[PDB]
Symmetry: C5
Subunit: 381 residues, 5 copies
Amino acid sequence: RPNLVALTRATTKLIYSDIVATQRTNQPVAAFYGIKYLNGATYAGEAGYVDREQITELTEESKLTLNKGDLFKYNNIVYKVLEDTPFATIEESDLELALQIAIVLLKVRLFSDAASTSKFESSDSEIADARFQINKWQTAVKSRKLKTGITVELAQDLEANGFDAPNFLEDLLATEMADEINKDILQSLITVSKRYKVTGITDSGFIDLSYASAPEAGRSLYRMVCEMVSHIQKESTYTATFCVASARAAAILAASGWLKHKPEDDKYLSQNAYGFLANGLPLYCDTNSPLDYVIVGVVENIGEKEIVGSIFYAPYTEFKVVVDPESLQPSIGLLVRYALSANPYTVAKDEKEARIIDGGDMDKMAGRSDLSVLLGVKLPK
Amino acid sequence: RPNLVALTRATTKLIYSDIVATQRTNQPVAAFYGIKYLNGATYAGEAGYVDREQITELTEESKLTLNKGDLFKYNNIVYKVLEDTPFATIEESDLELALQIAIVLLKVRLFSDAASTSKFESSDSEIADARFQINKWQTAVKSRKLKTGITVELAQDLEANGFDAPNFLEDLLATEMADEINKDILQSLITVSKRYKVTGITDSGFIDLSYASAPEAGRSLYRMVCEMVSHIQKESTYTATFCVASARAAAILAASGWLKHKPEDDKYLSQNAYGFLANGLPLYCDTNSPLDYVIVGVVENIGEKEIVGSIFYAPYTEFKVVVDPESLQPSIGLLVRYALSANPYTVAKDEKEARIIDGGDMDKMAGRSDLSVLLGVKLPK
Amino acid sequence: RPNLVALTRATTKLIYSDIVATQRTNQPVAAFYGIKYLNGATYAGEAGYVDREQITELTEESKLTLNKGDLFKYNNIVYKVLEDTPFATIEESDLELALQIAIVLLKVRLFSDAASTSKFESSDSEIADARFQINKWQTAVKSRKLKTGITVELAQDLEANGFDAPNFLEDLLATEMADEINKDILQSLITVSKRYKVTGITDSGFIDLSYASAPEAGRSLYRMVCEMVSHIQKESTYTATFCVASARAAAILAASGWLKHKPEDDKYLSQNAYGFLANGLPLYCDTNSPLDYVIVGVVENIGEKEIVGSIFYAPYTEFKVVVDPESLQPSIGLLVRYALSANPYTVAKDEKEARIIDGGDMDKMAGRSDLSVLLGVKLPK
Amino acid sequence: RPNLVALTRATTKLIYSDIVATQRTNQPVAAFYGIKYLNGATYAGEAGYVDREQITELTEESKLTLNKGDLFKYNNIVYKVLEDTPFATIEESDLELALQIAIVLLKVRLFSDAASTSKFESSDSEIADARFQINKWQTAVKSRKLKTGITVELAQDLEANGFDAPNFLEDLLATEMADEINKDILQSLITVSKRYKVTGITDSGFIDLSYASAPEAGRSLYRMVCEMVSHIQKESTYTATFCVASARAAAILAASGWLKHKPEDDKYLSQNAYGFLANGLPLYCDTNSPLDYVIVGVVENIGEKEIVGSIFYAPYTEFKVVVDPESLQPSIGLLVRYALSANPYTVAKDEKEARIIDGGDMDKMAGRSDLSVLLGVKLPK
Amino acid sequence: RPNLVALTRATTKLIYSDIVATQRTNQPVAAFYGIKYLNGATYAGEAGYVDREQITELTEESKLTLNKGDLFKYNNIVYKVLEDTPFATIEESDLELALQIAIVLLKVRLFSDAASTSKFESSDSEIADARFQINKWQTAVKSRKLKTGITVELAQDLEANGFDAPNFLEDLLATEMADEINKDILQSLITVSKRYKVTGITDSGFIDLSYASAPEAGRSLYRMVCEMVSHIQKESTYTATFCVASARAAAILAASGWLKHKPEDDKYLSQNAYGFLANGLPLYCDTNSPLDYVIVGVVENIGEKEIVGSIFYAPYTEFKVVVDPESLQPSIGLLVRYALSANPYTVAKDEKEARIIDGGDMDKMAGRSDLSVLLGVKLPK
């Protein structure tokens, strides 16, 4: 239906299609797709996995009983021993650091399992496993309808303003619809995003830049936000692609040199974006959420497929506007339906749990994104 | 009259046509239009409103009588309860903040009323109402005449300078006309803009960067200006789109790194702009008002119609420049007429009050923009 | 004279042609034109002025006798009274500031005299007078001449360098001529520029960044310069369009982050600019004058005519090169002539005084630009 | 195999192909080439060497026995003596500095052995030998393989997603493969890079920005990273061309104004870069290595050949994807083979050592890049 | 010889051809040309000079005996007296400053000798002499040669690498030649550059930012460097055009915020630039000299001729490559020759001194550039 296609074009141009992954449906449900994995470094191969288990866990009671040429693993990373008794000269008790140090000082070597053709073919060894699994799920399409284009005495007013009024009123209707869609998206993103936490939540409490705390410059938030990106980079094979925040949270707070105020509007910045940060990521401004929060996350793709995201959006078209001639008031209404969801497998161990949940159930998906993190923020007022 | 079209273009190119919404008339009055809503969050339907009233106002006393699956609303925002007794572990006494905490801690979830198509069609439920409505009003077209192109002995001098004088003089005269028009607009904007206020005005009194206060860098003003932009975003679905300030207020004061000196003018900047801010918005400069103030506000549109602004401008053409040869002086007279107004519905409960007021009456519209805010500023004088 | 025109093109490109206004002559004297007004706001009509006279001067003893609906004026700006006894609640003793407060708090309202067409036509009301007058004056075309293209054995040297020498030497001679001309321009500009003075000269003495004062970063000068631009905006209907400073004054001194070294050489920047500032304005540098000063001011045009400026330049062609074999030496003489002047009306009440003065008499025009100011600067030699 | 050519070209776009030198093979081994010299100043000729030997080693007891016209050399730099007894007036006891002082004070002069041909031909002298030698080596092509494109019930899922599933799965597998390859490269770069060290390592211990040290802004890291670039400039004939770091180490840590977030994805930056430093060089973000390190180094070419690099990559093509219908699971296997190596010459004096080592042996090449340096960083964890 | 043409054009792209003036020869010596002179303000005319002498030297004893209309001179600048007894109200005892002040306060006026046609023709007056004097000198073309193309066993390696080897080798050898040429130039620039000196050398000693002084940020060096530009501007009719410094002296030091690492290079920078400074002129880097210095200076041209430079370069061709296949060694030689020089007249009063010296004699030209200065720097090593 070309008229719905046109209304769709004129309404979705106004929504945050870029802070969610976009897919589409033609079904009562949307068949959504996504990619996930629970651990990250080196290989995912089983042959190699077994070797890791068959070499050593690197217990601190064994770290120095190793000698030149030996292998060991730690947190699944295989390393070779350079010269004898690695760590003999390292006072550090924490293996995470003792190892960090040992690598730097060339006591141990990050081990590469690239190997000859013969290794594989002769051994008839296992082969590397998947880094990620690809999921699919079906989430019902939900809708909302507006009945707002009031006509009657208004029809006369609209006729008086008839130059623009026919389409104008439909466009105004679409505008409010887009706004409600964006709110719905943001609520889901807020809900699904993992809470960002460091040492008992962002340096042992939600970041607090309140009057009684640290009304500095806004710099300490910018630092925390930058760290949120590192978290994503640490935990997933991506880099944050977008950020959303309220004005008080960052879209204004970061104005103190930590925010790039849309110097250009067609370069790495969408039309609905507020701007981007001093460290990039198009920044979107929420403006509605009472939290004055910040979200950092990833929306990505495989070829043309927007399969990577915390939230996925899939409109169901075959954005319809109608007039209902009730009484003397033949007003204009607008119906929009879409599926909105998170990858349900991030709350499931396997398909026998995924099959009894719904990616659109934001009570269950709460805090389970892993492609996004949420910063709670306390501000002056 | 094509010659007036040419004079119009050669005069309006010189005024801040974008710091007001621009409409046009052909009537003795301009039929102005604009959009307003009296409150945000979620859907605007009666069904919603009823469900909200039918669940709870979240009286603090009742916050722990809530359990998993329950709904509640606060400040008209609907939330669902995640697990039992939300807020049981939140020591915060200010319910607004306790709620923000509950959301980030996933004790409660921002709730969407989206539902299946069947829900609505089967139940014959109500439908979301309009949030914003379009208002109309009529404001008289006022005018200003100049008798400034003096010729006589002056004609002789103009003849001596006859190389340029004919058109030169008309453009010069047009320039003075444009100046007065622009200034007239700015005075209206100053008057209509809401006074910016936080905790008893800009942090309990207007910003004071005087000698006895904080002759810092001007950073503290930028901060407040940025908050003004936030305020607009908080209270309306717009970001600031422009700002005007005097030199001492910001057009010079902010030139300590928070003002961009028109690096370029063929992109992202109107030709009469002084430059733009570090907060992106086109910075204009008045230079006349004794106030040395800063105004932040928004102009916008639905498709082609500039329906959003604190002040609306509507010139009436059918920029008349004629010779008035009284005595021995074939001098040039210039007449421009236009309507200029604020949306009168911002000072009315309904149309029965709007119909007895005038959007052009700045004694009534004063401080009632909602699409702009004014910052009073005390300087090192 | 095409050969001289070619030299003109190749020589005037080497001077700061845009820090002064450019006009041209074809006469032994140059007829210069320019625009001035002596006090900026609202209408300049007699009706306006009379109504202002008929309402009040807003004296301290009368500001409280005003009530709702009354008008008053101050510093020629008309304001309307909002509600009774404006200023009743304002303790501020400086009436001008009290007024600024009253505007912000909506005790008074910036008032526009714009009115219906009928008001004007019915009463046969007066009309706005001109704000600015257009002046004309003439000065002699003055000249300089060189005997510097030395030839003899030099001819032999030039013959040795004969692949380039004919043109090379004329271009070189033209260059040194251009250099002195540029310097001459600066002397006139320096002289005419008004001394920037605030509270007994730029915060009660010329800015001093010497060792015994403020050997800081140069920031305090950058701030003062930006304020010089404000001064221009205050006193004239223009923003600064250029700035020139010595190395020690600002071309180097402000190069601590508030000065840019021509990052781009073809956009909004002349080929002769040293660079531009962080507060805009192409930046020029004199390098000769003992003053070590900074000048801020404006060149502006109506169509093609550079009518606005502190100094006006008007070259006279019909760059003459003459080859004269004194004895054994066919040296090259170079002659360049132009008018250069300040608008004499800045030192005159009317034509009777203008007719007995000379815009080229810099002993009278000194400090009388109003379209430019100079900052004296004490430096940490 | 055109399909593999396409898969390779369309997949290697995802690895840090430019932070290594890229060469290619068609053999079971890759023939790699690279360039090295042991010292940088003046000519590398025997005649020069002898003249230097014949004048002095600049013993501090002899530094002042020199007089005007004499030559001396120090650290292979030849200097001529200006005036008598150079250093007579230099109190500095450290000859390295005393020389720097003498040079700046014009007591000595940097000397060139350039001369007329007559000098050379008459003398029948020697000529400069090569500074840099070109070394070649062969390193076996190694591989990694996936058997992860799972099909069965998954085939049904892929059919359900049949719209684009065939290529999707291959593209995804190729992506995961690219990721593993890139990891292998990074481990090799980490290993080969020399440990940056000043006065016992980065000012007597690895940079430490831990909470017990200097949790500043990240400024101090930027400084050390920048110093690593100076090291590259000092010890080679190239400037750094790239930088790679973990997120915590710098992609995020330096995003306090010392790092740019890829504001442009096609200007002095590859598509795989996270950004570029405030001081340039595309910055790649590792994200996997536990080291939290920073690497600065070079890749450079002569004509089309990327002859210079610490690590060299040489893929062996004739990204192979096949399906193996074992059981009911006809999964997609993917194999990629390439040589990866360091120039073995950096750990050898000559061919009799080079012939018993392998550029691909990272247990020997560790710390021996000379075209890269790594900074260990202790972070505020 | 087309092969010399191709090799030279394709290789000199690698030397700092723009930090010297480029000229060319075809002779065994190069005929270099250049401009120097004694001062920089107003005219160079003898009659005007005499007038200066005929008015006053402005000794303080006479500064108060001057009255309205009088002229006086100081440091060859003529100034006019405004009103009587100039300086009567100036407490300053140092005439240099008293004059600076008097000019600012309009007690005196910079005097322009632009004059009427009558002045000149009536008196049949003299005419201005040259501000500049033009020199020519002849400097021998010296050669530098390489026997760097080692082939034998290497020839077989080159055959193995026959894909690239023929030209690869010549290009590489040519690259090393470019390096030596560049280094040769830099040594000459270092030597000729005048020591930047202020109050006994850059604030009474070479700038010292060492740990024993001021290990700040590097800001103080940037300030000194910017002053070096000032020096060029004060001493000559040019601004600095380029800057070269060691890696530690500026390429890295200024990374702290006063250096941009080539964010753009298809505009305003040479391909061999490191980047450019915050008060930028392309920043180049030597990487060899132990001095860790900074050079600031200027090259300039009249049409196509680079008549200005501290050092001039003039190559002589008829990059020549030869082969000497003794035994099994068909090795490649590379020969390049050029003249390199400073304007010898900077160390001569007249031709009887210039004719017995050589601009290529860096023992005599040491410290006598005047078109460049060098700063010694003590770094925090």
